Amino acid sequence: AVGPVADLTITDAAVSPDGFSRQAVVVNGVTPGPLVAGNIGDRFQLNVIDNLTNHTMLKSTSIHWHGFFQHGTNWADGPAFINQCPISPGHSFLYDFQVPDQAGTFWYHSHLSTQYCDGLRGPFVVYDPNDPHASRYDVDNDDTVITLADWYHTAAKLGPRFPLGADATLINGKGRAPSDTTAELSVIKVTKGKRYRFRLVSLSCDPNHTFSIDGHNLTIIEVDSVNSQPLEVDSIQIFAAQRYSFVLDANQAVDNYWIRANPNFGNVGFDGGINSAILRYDGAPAVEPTTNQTTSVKPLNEVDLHPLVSTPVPGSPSSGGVDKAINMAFNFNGSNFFINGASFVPPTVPVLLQILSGAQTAQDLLPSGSVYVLPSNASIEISFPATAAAPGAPHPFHLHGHTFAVVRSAGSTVYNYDNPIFRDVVSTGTPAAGDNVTIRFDTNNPGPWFLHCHIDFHLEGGFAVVMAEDTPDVKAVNPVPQAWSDLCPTYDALDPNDQ
């Protein structure tokens, strides 16, 4: 683990996480990037050093720290042309922010075009020395982080616009494609008799994964970065960019057990050990498990998750009982996605820079028809009705700058204004279920914040809008460092081929 103060050097390098060799974007020499860690209250100073040379995978870059509120530091959030211009090749940029009021499991990733798909992504943990769940496990360290990622043999800019799934699922950086089922698999070690806090992080660009471990049940204690009541399950469907902490009690016989992460599409199932890793008890021989999957009889359902501490839902407990209700109507024309009639196209001047330069109203802010001006210190309700007009469902939506209440989940026709889970990425479900996923949050974080489908190819296709929150205070609340004001002139001075 590096951090809370660290250099992250970005380069292009050859890698072969499933035995097939390809060029990729790597962080400190590896993909996924190394674990970044600290404790609640730390100040993070992550110096991002751009040494990229390969334009096909972009030579510029920009990093988002997924799940952090960034109160007072909206400039450090990451999304290109929303919160900054990209870092240019051969330059560095110091992201300097504090985490006074959050702890949990997070991650970081490029937030420039579809660059994270090519490798720029890794996990990020903020420990709490008074964690209220600390008494449920014995081990929680670098070796208890489990990442999942889709891997493609053809680069993001060189394959289809909307890929039909990945060549391999990788678990802690390794996995098999059907074309080579002898490639080395990841091993996660446990000691019989000890209890583990496993921190499961989806680094996926697209597929969701159905996650299970042969012979073991899992106790969910954290949802994205929110502590939950303990929920016992035997499988977990996890969508792109989501996180869960689960406790596993290593109390079965000393042996090798299959860890499984089945994608919703691409190469599904497990023939030859695809979509698998190995849980190995100390003592067991270094071989593959021969265990069998049994039918999940206790799968995670989101409506069953509730926060550990009572947290009132924003607003009054009835439909539209808030200061501002926004409905997101989806459309798609074969190459581009739309939200209320507008497909997102990044502006020339970053949204934050427009605001600092005086723009405060929906009328003044660009791009027109994609920026929503929200009142300050108010309750907001957003609904995302599922429709056949938007193929590639279920779309997992992410709100920057905020954790939100899920008042209505996918696969449920009920509204819960009493005790639903809060999180930061939510499946919007499917038209076959008649879904109308609905969320609420309060606006106490002045800044423009991205709201978008976390399937990166959908994002590249324009499936996004901007929440411009409390625009009269943005300038006063987020002072910016000189190195930030210098990003756009350096970036805009570049030759196109050096982007």
Ligand X SMILES: *[C@@H]1O[C@H](CO)[C@@H](O[C@@H]2O[C@H](CO)[C@@H](O[C@@H]3O[C@H](CO)[C@@H](O)[C@H](O)[C@@H]3O)[C@H](O)[C@H]2NC(C)=O)[C@H](O)[C@H]1NC(C)=O
Ligand Y SMILES: *[C@@H]1O[C@H](CO)[C@@H](O)[C@H](O)[C@H]1NC(C)=O
Ligand Z SMILES: *[C@@H]1O[C@H](CO)[C@@H](O[C@@H]2O[C@H](CO)[C@@H](O[C@@H]3O[C@H](CO[C@H]4O[C@H](CO)[C@@H](O)[C@H](O)[C@@H]4O)[C@@H](O)[C@H](O[C@H]4O[C@H](CO)[C@@H](O)[C@H](O)[C@@H]4O)[C@@H]3O)[C@H](O)[C@H]2NC(C)=O)[C@H](O)[C@H]1NC(C)=O
Q: Which residues are annotated as a binding site for Cu(2+)?
A: 64, 66, 109, 111, 395, 398, 400, 452-454, 458
- From residue 115, give the alpha-carbon distance in Å to each of 60, 80, 247, 335: 10, 11, 33, 19
Which of 192, 69, 73, 13 is CA-nearest to residue 484? 73
User: Of residues 327, 368, 377, 485, which one binds ligand Y by CB under 6 A?
Assistant: 377
Q: What is the spatial distance between Cα 238 and Cα 233, in angstroms, rounded to a whole number?
A: 13
User: Of residues 28, 436, 444, 499, which one binds ligand Y by CB under 6 A?
Assistant: 444
**Binding site: which residues?**
64, 66, 109, 111, 395, 398, 400, 452-454, 458
Residue 234 binds: one of Cu ion, ligand X, ligand Y, none (C-beta under 5 to 8 A by kind)? ligand Y
Nearer to ligand X (CB atom), residue 154 or residue 368: 154
Q: 160-165 — which CB contacts under 8 Å span 24+ positions? A: 161/335, 161/457, 161/461, 162/392, 162/457, 162/461, 163/206, 163/457, 164/265, 164/266, 165/206, 165/207, 165/263, 165/265, 165/266, 165/267
Q: Which of residues 438-457 bind Cu ion (CB under 5 A)?
A: 450, 453, 455
Q: How many residues bind ligand Y (CB under 6 A)?
A: 16
Q: Is 98 in the site for ligand Y (CB under 6 A)?
A: no
Candidates 154-162, 202-210, 259-267, 387-395; binding stretch for ligand X (CB under 6 A): 154-162
User: Of residues 6, 22, 28, 442, which one binds ligand X by CB under 6 A?
Assistant: 22
CA-atom Rg of the chain in angstroms: 22
Candidates 23-31, 279-287, 341-349, 393-401; binding stretch for Cu ion (CB under 5 A): 393-401
* Site residues for ligand Z per CB under 6 A: 319-320, 325, 327, 383, 385, 436
DSSP 225: T
Asked if 184 contacts 174 with a C-beta cutoff of 8 angstroms, the reply is: yes
Per-residue interface string for the shown chain with ligand Y, residues 161-200, x marking contact by CB under 6 A: ----------------------------------------
Q: Is 121 in the site for Cu ion (CB under 5 A)?
A: no
| Backbone angles phi and psi of 216, in degrees to 5 | -140, 145
Q: Is 379 in the site for ligand Y (CB under 6 A)?
A: yes
Per-residue interface string for the shown chain with Na ion, residues 193-232, x marking contact by CB under 5 A: --------------------------------x-------
Q: Is 234 in the site for ligand Y (CB under 6 A)?
A: yes
Q: Is 11 in the site for ligand X (CB under 6 A)?
A: no
Which sign does the torsion angle of CA 482, 485, 491, 493 carry?
A: negative
Contact residues for 291 (Cβ-Cβ < 8 A; gap 6+): 214, 215, 255, 256, 257, 258
Q: Is 154 in the site for ligand X (CB under 6 A)?
A: yes
Residue 56 Cβ vs ligand X, minimum distance, rounded to whole Å = 4
Residue 364 binds: one of ligand Y, Na ion, ligand X, none (C-beta under 5 to 8 A by kind)? none
Nearer to ligand Z (CB atom), residue 433 or residue 483: 433
Q: Is 487 in the site for ligand X (CB under 6 A)?
A: no
Nearer to ligand X (CB atom), residue 55 or residue 136: 55
- From residue 48, give the alpha-carbon distance in Å to each of 22, 87, 117, 153, 432: 23, 9, 18, 27, 44
User: Of residues 82, 203, 241, 382, which one binds Cu ion by CB under 5 A?
Assistant: 241
Asked if 426 contacts 437 with a C-beta cutoff of 8 angstroms, the reply is: yes
How long is the chain? Answer: 499
Which of 494, 499, 479, 491 is CA-nearest to residue 349? 491
Per-residue interface string for the shown chain with Na ion, residues 287-306, x marking contact by CB under 5 A: -----x--------------
Q: Is 378 in the site for ligand Y (CB under 6 A)?
A: yes
Q: Is 56 in the site for ligand X (CB under 6 A)?
A: yes
Show which residues are catalytic: 64, 66, 109, 111, 395, 398, 400, 452-455, 458, 463
Q: Is 192 in the site for ligand X (CB under 6 A)?
A: no
Which sign does the torsion angle of CA 469, 474, 479, 481 carry?
A: positive
DSSP 309: S
Q: Is 155 in the site for ligand X (CB under 6 A)?
A: yes
Q: What is the spatial distance between Cα 304 and Cα 220, in angstroms, rounded to a whole number?
A: 11
Q: Is 201 in the site for ligand X (CB under 6 A)?
A: no
Q: What is the spatial distance between Cα 219 and Cα 226, in angstroms, rounded to a whole number?
A: 15
Q: What is the spatial distance between Cα 462 and Cα 460, in angstroms, rounded to a whole number?
A: 5
Q: Is 11 in the site for ligand Y (CB under 6 A)?
A: no
30: its two tokens = 């590896």
Backbone breaks in the chain after residues (C–N over 2.5 Å): none
Q: Is 66 in the site for Cu ion (CB under 5 A)?
A: yes
User: Of residues 129, 160, 285, 334, which one binds ligand Y by CB under 6 A?
Assistant: 334
Nearer to ligand Z (CB atom), residue 144 or residue 383: 383
Q: Which residues bind Na ion (CB under 5 A)?
A: 103-104, 225, 292
Q: Which residues bind ligand X (CB under 6 A)?
A: 22-23, 54, 56-57, 154-155, 158
